[PDB]
Amino acid sequence: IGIRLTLPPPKVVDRWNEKRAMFGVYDNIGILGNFEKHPKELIRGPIWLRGWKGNELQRCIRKRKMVGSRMFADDLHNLNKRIRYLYKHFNRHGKFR
């Protein structure tokens, strides 16, 4: 019974809307623009992970470091608890040593 009895409404994807059509433009802004701008400066997203990558523990440390003072009280409490938990997990649990 975990099966729907009617076909879902058709999903129409416009492969040539402006976003898809211009996707990727200026990804070579650096190598084609005398390196005035790095491609990572094209990244739009959270301030604490623009042009940066890491596992969850590193992400949480960076988030607290960069916007921790602007976080809501309970969100910051949750972040501190998450950092503590992830520290314990990554430094004390696991198959490998």
């Binding site: 211009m22 200026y26 094209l42």
Partner: protein, 87 residues
């Protein structure tokens, strides 16, 4: 379609308003002004005379030099007396 205008570095110096509380402190000191001058020259609007130590700063630098970096003659004298004692 046509691509949006390419992203470009903001031309010329960037002077944040010190009144704004959200302006980072590292963007308000003399070092920021010195870097702006190095980067943009006269267009910066930085008075070139501000790039050198002010007299109090010069006095502090001279005091630090006297305190920590001895003269060549002093170093040589210390070496000579140490050698004499060892001999």
């Amino acid at each position: 379609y046509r691509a949006r205008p390419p992203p470009r570095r903001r031309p010329g110096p960037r002077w944040p308003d010190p009144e704004d509380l959200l302006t980072p402190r590292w963007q308000l000191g003399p070092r920021y002004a010195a870097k702006q001058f190095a980067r943009y020259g006269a267009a910066s609007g930085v008075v070139p005379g501000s790039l050198w130590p002010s007299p109090e700063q010069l006095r502090e630098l001279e005091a630090e030099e006297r305190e920590w970096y001895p003269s060549l003659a002093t170093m040589q004298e210390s070496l000579r007396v140490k050698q004499l004692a060892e001999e």
